[PDB]
Design a protein around this nucleic acid. Structure first.
Ligand SMILES: Nc1nc2c(ncn2[C@@H]2O[C@H](COP(=O)(O)OP(=O)(O)OP(=O)(O)O)[C@@H](O)[C@H]2O)c(=O)[nH]1
Ligand SMILES: Nc1nc2c(ncn2[C@@H]2O[C@H](COP(=O)(O)OP(=O)(O)OP(=O)(O)O)[C@@H](O)[C@H]2O)c(=O)[nH]1
Ligand SMILES: [Mg+2]
Ligand SMILES: [Mg+2]
Ligand SMILES: [Mg+2]
Ligand SMILES: [Mg+2]
Ligand SMILES: [Mg+2]
Ligand SMILES: [Mg+2]
Ligand SMILES: [Mg+2]
Ligand SMILES: [Mg+2]
Ligand SMILES: [Mg+2]
Ligand SMILES: [Mg+2]
Ligand SMILES: [Mg+2]
Ligand SMILES: [Mg+2]
Ligand SMILES: [Mg+2]
Ligand SMILES: [Mg+2]
Ligand SMILES: [Mg+2]
Ligand SMILES: [Mg+2]
Ligand SMILES: [Mg+2]
Ligand SMILES: [Mg+2]
Ligand SMILES: [Mg+2]
Ligand SMILES: [Mg+2]
Ligand SMILES: [Mg+2]
Ligand SMILES: [Mg+2]
Ligand SMILES: [Mg+2]
Ligand SMILES: [Mg+2]
Ligand SMILES: [Mg+2]
Ligand SMILES: [Mg+2]
Ligand SMILES: [Mg+2]
Ligand SMILES: [Mg+2]
Ligand SMILES: [Mg+2]
Ligand SMILES: [Mg+2]
Ligand SMILES: [Mg+2]
Ligand SMILES: [Mg+2]
Ligand SMILES: [Mg+2]
Ligand SMILES: [Mg+2]
Ligand SMILES: [Mg+2]
Ligand SMILES: [Mg+2]
Ligand SMILES: [Mg+2]
Ligand SMILES: [Mg+2]
Ligand SMILES: [Mg+2]
Ligand SMILES: [Mg+2]
Ligand SMILES: [Mg+2]
Ligand SMILES: [Mg+2]
Ligand SMILES: [Mg+2]
Ligand SMILES: [Mg+2]
Ligand SMILES: [Mg+2]
Lengths: 37, 401, 120, 109
RNA sequence: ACCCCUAUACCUUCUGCAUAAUGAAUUAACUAGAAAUAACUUUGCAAGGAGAGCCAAAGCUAAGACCCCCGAAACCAGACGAGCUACCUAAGAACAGCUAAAAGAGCACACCCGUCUAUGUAGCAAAAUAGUGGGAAGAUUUAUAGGUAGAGGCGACAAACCUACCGAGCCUGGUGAUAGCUGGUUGUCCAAGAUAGAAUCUUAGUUCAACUUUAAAUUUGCCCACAGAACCCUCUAAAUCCCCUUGUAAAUUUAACUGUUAGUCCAAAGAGGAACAGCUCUUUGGACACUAGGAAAAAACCUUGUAGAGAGAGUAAAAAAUUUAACACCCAUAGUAGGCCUAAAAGCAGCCACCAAUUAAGAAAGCGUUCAAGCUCAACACAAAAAUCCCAAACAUAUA
RNA sequence: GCCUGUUUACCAAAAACAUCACCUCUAGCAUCACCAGUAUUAGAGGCACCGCCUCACUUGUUCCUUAAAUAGGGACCUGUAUGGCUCCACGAGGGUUCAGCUGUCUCUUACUUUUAACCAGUGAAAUUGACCUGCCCGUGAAGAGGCGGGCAUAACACAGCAAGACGAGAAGACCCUAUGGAGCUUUAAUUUAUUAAUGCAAACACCUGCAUUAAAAAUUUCGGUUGGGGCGACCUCGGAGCAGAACCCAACCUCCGAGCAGUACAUGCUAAGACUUCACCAGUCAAAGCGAACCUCAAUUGAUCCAAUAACUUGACCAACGGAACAAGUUACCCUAGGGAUAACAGCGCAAUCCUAUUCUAGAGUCCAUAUCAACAAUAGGGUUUACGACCUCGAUGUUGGAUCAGGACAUCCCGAUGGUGCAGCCGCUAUUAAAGGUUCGUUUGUUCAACGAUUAAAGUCCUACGUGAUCUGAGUUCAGACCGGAGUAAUCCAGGUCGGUUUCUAUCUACUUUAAUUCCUCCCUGUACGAAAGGACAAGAGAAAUAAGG
């Protein structure tokens, strides 16, 4: 299989773990701003 | 793609027609013309050896010739093989050239399917050459497997492909009947515009209907789809003109008959309009070709008999002479078309007295073409001159005693 | 192609936040590393295998003392993903000849020079 | 259609990098074109290979390029160069280590 | 004892075998590494050694150690075969009955053959039985004796037949033929040990190289700081070479050898294919061809490796997550059917302008009209499916 | 094919071989064949009686035959090609056919004998790693009794069955390989030892020696790479990408080129030290010195031996280019050693091809994307086609169809329910749900298919080792025989046509062996609803049948 595939090539499990661990974590704003004056 | 062609015309105008066919390809250029006489059209070499050697030396001396277009309806396999070997270039006939332009211009799925059916004979003829690169010298010594040989398997595959194409075309014919159901039920008069290739059918339909989306091209076989466009006659009656595919002479009947699936709309037409290209030198030969093509298509005999004729392209130079581009005889032609549809669709132009109440007048407007209304207020009624079909007349008689 | 990895130098430039987190003053740096192999050299390149052998970290979870000098640091950078590096701490100072037989390397990284094995 | 291209690698290039002790006659670098130009105490063979003309240490430097006036192509390139421009090339040098010799007392006449 | 938990016979071959690849029913017995040159070790003697010959610039003498089994189709020589069969020679024999008449005549016995079917297929039979069928006074069938013998004979040529297996008989001998091919290659224990290519009638093999093993001599071996290694080309990758220190202990050389040189997947840079293949081809690296744990079972993924006993302990990798589409309500007079355009084209076929009245309305954003008309709107007002039968059971809330 | 006859004993009995007749060639002669013969003779051959000539076969159209014909027969029409037409009789030869006949079949049944089962006597064979020998799904050396997850599970005989144990049998006959064989053919290489001629010698025609020419033979070979093998292409050397930066890197990978030329005659001799195409061989650079003056080009070539030469030196497009001194074809007459390292069937990977569904809203559909479709394209799903790969199997996984029995999926052909419609009704089209049940008989052709005839409610698409040959058939394909057309000098071969051609197995194990029906049609509703007419319904009810199951 080439580096560029027409389909999403399966990642090596370690690469998958890397991508899962380095996912974007949004900032949790403690108290939800919606229900603050 | 790009092809420089030598137009080799056997002889026993046509050169101009073949040149137009070549120009239609958008990448094919005639770089030489050779009108050669012969007394034996049917032979392995169409020309006697005396002319054949001269043609061969001329063709091989000219280096710009990428191919040769032999203006013959269809050349046999031995003839093609011998000519190819002698002239060292590809050989094309009327069948192959027309088939190529059909494939190029075909855009709709229906057109592609029909041109595939038309191609089928070409594929059968070129089967040996198209599979010569797959033989691999396997057969008759491998002791296991289906008994079919290489050529037998290839022929079986070709037959299966043809069967698939024919099944798809039968489904297409059923769907075309389904589409025609509604127009038939509502009793729209249908006029099928037939004629020789490039004679102005599309231009005439554009002139009659007034539509702007219609694009009459300059190349041959521009229209490959049978399509219906509505128009209005002087009697305020709406008539549906069916633009069809043009016909060509000295061409195998099977090529055009492969379009019968979509051309069956012509059979169900109420009238047929033959667009004669009077300005063309060979208008008589074109008439013979189109009439023979229609008979081969098996159009109804009453319809072919009632066929009207219109002489288009009269500007360049018992019937109605018309000029589609200039729009000269269009009003007259519309008058004769009105008369023809009245006498063909069984529509009676009659005066009818109706009480000016109960929505009878509105019913007549919506179910018939009210030519005029003369109202008598003293009796509170109206006499309508209306073109009404038999079905509409019966409905009115029952609904409003 | 998979090749040896050149670690950018900016990786090994500690920040004040790193100093606060890990408890190490940029001035007065520690002298010795306690290095323990916490990862197998199997499925790793032969150069990493060789560097591990050179550092003498063949046995896992076996602390080894090394100099905190640029060359040893370069080797440790090469094999940094297979090892745990901590600063060797000497609360009672360097062991002397008298107490050389009573030393012990506590899990905290401190080389205590008196090991009585008695309650405090 | 494509025939040939089976030639193997010439195994050319630098044989002595900078700082390498080199004895007289050693080939420093083999090249098909003039990648590294001969410097002090470095000679060129017929096939453009650089060999050490003296025993010493190899040093690679960048030095201005001044072709021989009879090298027509290089002189034309220079003639077309804009003013202020100076060509540079990589030169290979052999810094001789040992002295040519020593004066020794041979006889106390 | 079983029930509990763990456990995919062995050998060979292979990249990889529980493999549904080979061999093996099992017991007993038999059944397969022969050796020179040069080296190595140990003695003797020593510028000499040796029991003539030979060697010698520490050699020489002696000893120790050192290289398998079965298997072809074949080829040639000499014998033996024509009691089967092919043909021929000598002298013999058989051919009912009927029709016809001196018949390579017809029907049809004996007789000879073997068309078709069934049975049989380790059979009654290494070619048969039953029925059916062809010939059956002839080029017929057959008894007896003889002849032609293999680079041959004989042949109404089917490459037929020649003593059951004739593209060339059989036996013996050369012969233990040869086989780069397959199979086999028998006590215990420990250790080192998977690694670029070149040439080759060569890619099923071999020689050299590389790798590997042993012994010996010596000193640098690996990791690697600066500095350094090209323009063509305007820009441009991971990196590489070289390399003191440093951490380490290996490296080179000498002597003597084999064996591996038909390889798999994974990550990455690419090429071919179709940006298919558990596809093929190079490069860097890893793993497997070795142990163990995990990913379900699992050669190639992850963890982990140097080996024993323990009814101790800390850990490594190691368990998937997800559930997704409501929505405005009211209201509409009108410069005029704005001009041109066209039969008319009227907000709506096209072009120009796109102002303007009513508090509030585009010279009209979509339908609809041949054209109109009628409808609104804008404006006011308030995700999937295939074939034997889904696939642990389950579980949302007890403090990492 | 003239006929009677002959033949592959043991798969082919024939159209093949022979055959009278005819034709071609050779020979003028006796004491072992021919021949105890003598040109009306003998031998070696070709073809096939006789008779007529020196027209036959191919391209299409058509007629008869059948209800239906790729079958059979007969015409005409286009081009190819002194050995072509003519069937009298005959034929276990190959096709077609009237009529009859009949269990061939619709559609099987009854009985007798053998076999069989039980009792008694006698008593094998292949086979066999050990077996304490289950099913489903998944996995895996790519198809599990043994592995993972489930399910099932007291132990045993006896009789049947043939789905599996890639079942037994033959170290696969197919295919490839081996510097393994053999048969045959040759204008393959090398010879003429042997015969027959001649010529020259020797002797005075014969014999002997030496040459030349033929016949006959003999020995030996028939390269490699290769996405299996064949065909085609290629085989050595150099430059550039792939391989961006020390070196090195494959490809039947992309492109370029070379097999010289030119100039000089110190293009002399020597000699440190280095490079090196990953070995060796070979190939490179070169200080200093003597002697002199004051080599360009990337490749531009080839070893040993052996020949020529007094010597120096020279000699192969030895291009299969590390080079055999000199050797080709064919084998289905084949053989042996192996190979699943390598092909054909199958499985498996893949999905280019193929099939299917959605998305876009161009375009058809009179207007109207969306009743039905649908271009350019996008996203998905399937594993039924044509392919590609070569992963299991070559110490055998038996092959296309058909019979028999069928298991399964639903992407439904019919029967059921429902939505839309360009649904007035009847016919329909489309879509959702539904796999309980069903899904015909015939002519031609081996046909799976296809065309045609008559039906049906329908004559569904597939998978199951292209389900099913230890249940069957062998018509084709695909052995050995033989023709016709083509290729070749021939042997022989051919993706051309055809006639004939051995179908083994007693069951050890697993598995299994007695489990509320559908549909059509007739009548009535009703000639009603609907419809202008034509035509023409549902629902409910009654009656008839057919099939299937059980008796
Ligand atoms: N001078 C002239 N030209 C005309 C006239 N009518 C038609 N033509 C041309 O004839 C050609 C025909 O174009 P179409 O009308 O599209 O052709 P068609 O008849 O549909 O035929 P196909 O192209 O075969 O489909 C075009 O070049 C027209 O312009 C006429 O009256 N006068
Ligand atoms: N070096 C070399 N040797 C040759 C050449 N030609 C022939 N030979 C030698 O001769 C052998 C070839 O023998 P042939 O082929 O018979 O030679 P030929 O010259 O063609 O013919 P004969 O003279 O009959 O041998 C080679 O192997 C060499 O031993 C050549 O061009 N060069
Ligand atoms: Mg047109
Ligand atoms: Mg190259
Ligand atoms: Mg086995
Ligand atoms: Mg095997
Ligand atoms: Mg066995
Ligand atoms: Mg006899
Ligand atoms: Mg008699
Ligand atoms: Mg007789
Ligand atoms: Mg024969
Ligand atoms: Mg034969
Ligand atoms: Mg015998
Ligand atoms: Mg042997
Ligand atoms: Mg070991
Ligand atoms: Mg341990
Ligand atoms: Mg509004
Ligand atoms: Mg006969
Ligand atoms: Mg006979
Ligand atoms: Mg005989
Ligand atoms: Mg026989
Ligand atoms: Mg016989
Ligand atoms: Mg027979
Ligand atoms: Mg004959
Ligand atoms: Mg028949
Ligand atoms: Mg008994
Ligand atoms: Mg399974
Ligand atoms: Mg039983
Ligand atoms: Mg049985
Ligand atoms: Mg088993
Ligand atoms: Mg078997
Ligand atoms: Mg075998
Ligand atoms: Mg063969
Ligand atoms: Mg041989
Ligand atoms: Mg070298
Ligand atoms: Mg070679
Ligand atoms: Mg044959
Ligand atoms: Mg064999
Ligand atoms: Mg296959
Ligand atoms: Mg394989
Ligand atoms: Mg492979
Ligand atoms: Mg077996
Ligand atoms: Mg469904
Ligand atoms: Mg057969
Ligand atoms: Mg027969
Ligand atoms: Mg046959
Ligand atoms: Mg059988």
């Amino acid at each position: 299989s080439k580096a560029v595939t027409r389909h999403r090539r399966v990642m090596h499990f370690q690469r998958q773990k890397l991508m899962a661990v380095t996912e974007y974590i949004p900032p949790k704003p403690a108290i939800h701003p919606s229900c603050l004056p | 793609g790009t092809q420089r062609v030598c137009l080799v015309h056997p002889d026993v105008w046509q050169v101009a027609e073949a040149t137009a066919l070549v120009h239609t390809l958008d990448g094919w250029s005639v770089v030489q013309t050779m009108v050669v006489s012969t007394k034996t059209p049917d032979r392995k070499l169409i020309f006697g050896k005396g002319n054949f050697e001269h043609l061969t030396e001329k063709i091989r001396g000219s280096p710009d010739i990428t191919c040769v277009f032999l203006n013959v309806e269809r050349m046999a396999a031995p003839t093609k093989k011998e000519l190819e070997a002698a002239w060292g270039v590809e050989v094309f006939d009327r069948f192959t050239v027309v088939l190529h332009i059909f494939r190029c211009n075909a855009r709709t799925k229906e057109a592609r399917l029909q041109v595939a059916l038309a191609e089928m004979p070409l594929h059968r003829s070129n089967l040996k050459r198209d599979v010569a690169h797959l033989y691999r010298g396997v057969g008759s010594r491998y002791i296991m497997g289906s008994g079919e040989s290489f050529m037998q398997l290839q022929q079986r595959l070709l037959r299966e492909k043809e069967a698939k194409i024919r099944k798809a075309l039968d489904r297409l014919r059923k769907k075309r009947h389904l589409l025609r159901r509604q127009r038939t039920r509502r009793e729209f008069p249908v006029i099928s515009v037939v004629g020789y290739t490039n004679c102005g059918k599309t231009t005439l339909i554009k002139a009659l209907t007034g539509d702007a989306a219609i694009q009459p091209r300059d190349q041959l076989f521009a229209t490959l789809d049978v399509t219906a466009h509505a128009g209005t006659l002087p009697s305020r009656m709406t008539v549906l003109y069916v633009d069809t595919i043009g016909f060509l002479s000295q061409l195998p009947h099977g090529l055009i008959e492969s379009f019968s699936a979509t051309l069956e709309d012509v059979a169900h037409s109420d009238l047929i309009l033959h667009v004669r290209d009077v300005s063309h030198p060979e208008a008589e030969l074109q008439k013979c070709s189109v009439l023979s093509t229609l008979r081969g298509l098996q159009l109804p005999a009453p319809l072919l008999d009632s066929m009207v004729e219109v002489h288009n392209k009269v500007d360049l130079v018992n019937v109605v002479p018309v000029s589609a581009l200039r729009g000269h005889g269009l009003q007259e032609l519309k008058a004769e078309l009105d008369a023809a549809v009245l006498k063909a669709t069984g529509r009676q132009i009659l005066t009818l007295r109706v009480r000016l109440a109960g929505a009878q007048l509105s019913w007549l407007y919506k179910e018939a073409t009210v030519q005029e209304v003369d109202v008598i207020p003293e009796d509170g009624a109206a006499d309508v001159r209306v073109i009404i079909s038999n079905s509409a007349y019966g409905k009115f008689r029952k609904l409003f005693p | 192609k998979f090749t040896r990895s050149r670690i950018p130098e900016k990786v090994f430039q500690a920040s004040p936040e790193d100093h606060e987190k890990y408890g190490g003053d940029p001035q007065n740096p520690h002298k010795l590393h306690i290095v323990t192999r916490i990862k197998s050299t199997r499925r790793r390149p032969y150069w990493e295998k060789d560097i591990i052998k050179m550092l003498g970290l063949e046995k896992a979870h076996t602390p080894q003392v090394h100099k905190n000098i640029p060359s040893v640091n370069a080797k440790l950078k090469v094999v940094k993903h297979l090892i745990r590096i901590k600063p060797l701490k000497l609360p009672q100072g360097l062991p002397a000849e008298e107490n050389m037989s009573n030393t012990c390397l506590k899990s905290t990284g401190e080389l205590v020079v008196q090991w009585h094995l008695k309650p405090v | 259609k494509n025939l040939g291209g089976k030639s193997s690698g010439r195994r050319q290039g630098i044989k002595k990098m900078e700082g390498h002790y080199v004895h007289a006659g050693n080939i420093i670098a083999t090249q098909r074109h003039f990648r590294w130009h001969p410097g002090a105490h470095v000679g060129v063979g017929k096939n453009k290979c650089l060999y050490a003309l003296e025993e010493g240490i190899v040093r690679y430097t960048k030095e201005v390029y001044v072709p021989h006036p009879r090298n027509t192509e290089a002189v034309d390139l220079i003639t077309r160069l804009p003013k202020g421009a100076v060509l540079y090339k990589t030169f290979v040098h052999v810094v001789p280590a040992k002295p040519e010799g020593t004066f020794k007392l041979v006889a106390m006449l």
